[PDB]
Coordinates of all heavy atoms in Angstrom, one line a residue:
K1 N 156.1 114.4 55.7 CA 155.2 114.0 56.8 C 155.1 115.1 57.8 O 154.1 115.1 58.6 CB 155.7 112.7 57.4 CG 155.3 111.5 56.6 CD 153.8 111.2 56.6 CE 153.4 110.1 55.7 NZ 152.6 109.0 56.3
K2 N 156.0 116.1 57.9 CA 155.8 117.3 58.7 C 154.6 118.0 58.2 O 154.5 118.1 57.0 CB 157.0 118.2 58.7 CG 158.1 118.0 59.8 CD 159.0 119.2 59.9 CE 160.4 118.7 60.3 NZ 161.5 119.7 59.9
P3 N 153.8 118.6 59.1 CA 152.7 119.5 58.6 C 153.3 120.7 57.9 O 154.5 121.1 58.1 CB 152.0 119.9 59.9 CG 152.7 119.2 61.0 CD 153.6 118.2 60.5
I4 N 152.4 121.3 57.0 CA 152.6 122.6 56.4 C 151.5 123.5 56.9 O 150.3 123.1 57.0 CB 152.6 122.5 54.9 CG1 153.7 121.6 54.4 CG2 152.7 123.9 54.3 CD1 153.6 121.2 53.0
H5 N 151.8 124.7 57.3 CA 150.8 125.7 57.7 C 150.7 126.7 56.6 O 151.6 127.4 56.1 CB 151.3 126.5 58.9 CG 151.5 125.7 60.1 ND1 150.5 125.5 61.1 CD2 152.6 125.0 60.5 CE1 151.0 124.7 62.1 NE2 152.3 124.4 61.7
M6 N 149.4 126.8 56.1 CA 149.0 127.8 55.0 C 148.2 128.9 55.7 O 147.1 128.7 56.2 CB 148.1 127.0 54.0 CG 147.5 127.8 53.0 SD 146.9 126.8 51.6 CE 147.8 125.3 51.8
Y7 N 148.7 130.1 55.7 CA 148.0 131.3 56.2 C 147.2 131.9 55.1 O 147.6 131.9 53.9 CB 149.0 132.4 56.7 CG 149.6 132.1 57.9 CD1 149.4 130.9 58.6 CD2 150.6 132.9 58.5 CE1 150.0 130.6 59.8 CE2 151.2 132.7 59.6 CZ 150.9 131.5 60.3 OH 151.6 131.2 61.4
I8 N 146.0 132.4 55.4 CA 145.0 132.7 54.4 C 144.4 134.0 54.8 O 143.6 134.1 55.8 CB 143.9 131.7 54.2 CG1 144.6 130.4 53.4 CG2 142.7 132.2 53.5 CD1 143.9 129.1 53.7
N9 N 144.6 135.1 54.0 CA 143.9 136.4 54.1 C 143.7 136.8 52.6 O 144.6 137.5 52.1 CB 144.6 137.4 54.9 CG 143.8 138.7 54.9 OD1 144.4 139.8 55.1 ND2 142.5 138.6 54.8
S10 N 142.6 136.4 52.0 CA 142.4 136.6 50.6 C 141.0 137.0 50.4 O 140.1 136.5 51.2 CB 142.7 135.3 49.8 OG 142.3 135.3 48.5
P11 N 140.7 137.9 49.4 CA 139.3 138.1 49.1 C 138.8 137.3 47.9 O 137.6 137.3 47.7 CB 139.4 139.6 48.6 CG 140.7 139.6 48.0 CD 141.6 138.8 48.8
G12 N 139.6 136.4 47.3 CA 139.2 135.6 46.2 C 140.2 135.5 45.1 O 141.4 135.9 45.3
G13 N 139.8 135.1 43.9 CA 140.7 135.1 42.8 C 140.2 134.3 41.6 O 139.2 133.6 41.7
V14 N 140.9 134.4 40.5 CA 140.8 133.5 39.4 C 140.5 132.0 39.8 O 141.4 131.3 40.3 CB 142.2 133.5 38.6 CG1 142.1 132.8 37.2 CG2 142.7 134.9 38.5
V15 N 139.3 131.6 39.5 CA 138.8 130.3 40.0 C 139.8 129.2 39.7 O 140.2 128.4 40.6 CB 137.4 130.0 39.5 CG1 137.0 128.6 39.9 CG2 136.5 131.0 40.1
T16 N 140.3 129.1 38.5 CA 141.2 127.9 38.2 C 142.5 128.0 38.9 O 143.1 127.0 39.3 CB 141.4 127.9 36.7 OG1 142.0 129.1 36.2 CG2 140.1 127.6 35.9
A17 N 143.0 129.2 39.1 CA 144.2 129.4 39.9 C 144.0 128.7 41.3 O 144.7 127.8 41.7 CB 144.6 130.8 40.1
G18 N 142.9 129.2 42.0 CA 142.6 128.6 43.3 C 142.5 127.1 43.2 O 142.9 126.3 44.1
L19 N 141.9 126.6 42.1 CA 141.7 125.2 42.0 C 143.1 124.5 41.8 O 143.2 123.2 42.0 CB 140.9 124.8 40.8 CG 139.4 125.2 41.0 CD1 138.6 124.7 39.8 CD2 138.9 124.6 42.3
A20 N 144.1 125.2 41.4 CA 145.4 124.6 41.4 C 146.1 124.5 42.8 O 146.7 123.5 43.1 CB 146.3 125.3 40.4
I21 N 145.9 125.6 43.5 CA 146.3 125.5 44.9 C 145.5 124.4 45.6 O 146.1 123.6 46.4 CB 146.0 126.8 45.7 CG1 146.7 128.0 44.9 CG2 146.5 126.7 47.1 CD1 146.4 129.4 45.4
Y22 N 144.2 124.3 45.4 CA 143.4 123.2 45.9 C 144.1 121.9 45.5 O 144.6 121.1 46.4 CB 142.0 123.2 45.5 CG 141.2 122.0 46.0 CD1 140.8 122.0 47.4 CD2 140.9 120.9 45.3 CE1 140.1 120.9 47.9 CE2 140.2 119.8 45.8 CZ 139.8 119.8 47.1 OH 139.1 118.7 47.7
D23 N 144.1 121.6 44.2 CA 144.6 120.3 43.8 C 145.9 120.0 44.4 O 146.2 118.8 44.7 CB 144.7 120.3 42.2 CG 143.5 119.8 41.6 OD1 142.6 119.3 42.3 OD2 143.4 119.9 40.3
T24 N 146.8 121.0 44.5 CA 148.1 120.7 45.0 C 148.0 120.3 46.5 O 148.6 119.2 46.9 CB 149.1 121.8 44.8 OG1 149.2 122.1 43.4 CG2 150.4 121.5 45.4
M25 N 147.3 121.0 47.3 CA 147.0 120.7 48.7 C 146.7 119.2 48.8 O 147.3 118.4 49.5 CB 145.9 121.5 49.2 CG 146.4 122.8 49.8 SD 145.1 124.0 49.9 CE 144.4 123.7 51.5
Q26 N 145.6 118.8 48.0 CA 145.2 117.4 48.1 C 146.2 116.4 47.7 O 146.3 115.3 48.2 CB 143.9 117.3 47.4 CG 142.8 118.2 47.9 CD 142.4 117.9 49.3 OE1 141.8 116.9 49.6 NE2 142.6 118.8 50.2
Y27 N 147.2 116.9 46.8 CA 148.1 116.0 46.3 C 149.2 115.6 47.3 O 149.5 114.4 47.5 CB 148.7 116.6 45.0 CG 149.8 115.8 44.4 CD1 149.5 114.9 43.4 CD2 151.1 116.1 44.6 CE1 150.5 114.2 42.8 CE2 152.1 115.4 44.0 CZ 151.8 114.4 43.0 OH 152.8 113.7 42.4
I28 N 149.8 116.6 48.1 CA 151.0 116.4 48.9 C 150.6 115.5 50.1 O 149.5 115.6 50.7 CB 151.6 117.7 49.3 CG1 150.7 118.5 50.2 CG2 152.2 118.4 48.2 CD1 151.3 119.8 50.6
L29 N 151.6 114.7 50.5 CA 151.5 113.8 51.6 C 151.3 114.5 53.0 O 150.8 113.8 53.9 CB 152.8 113.0 51.7 CG 152.9 111.5 51.2 CD1 152.2 110.6 52.1 CD2 152.4 111.5 49.8

């Protein structure tokens, strides 16, 4: 329940990789 801070300085990447970071984000409480 504590927040997590995600810092982001990225030019892009392997779409499905990013979609796994996405999916995980949406998963966690």
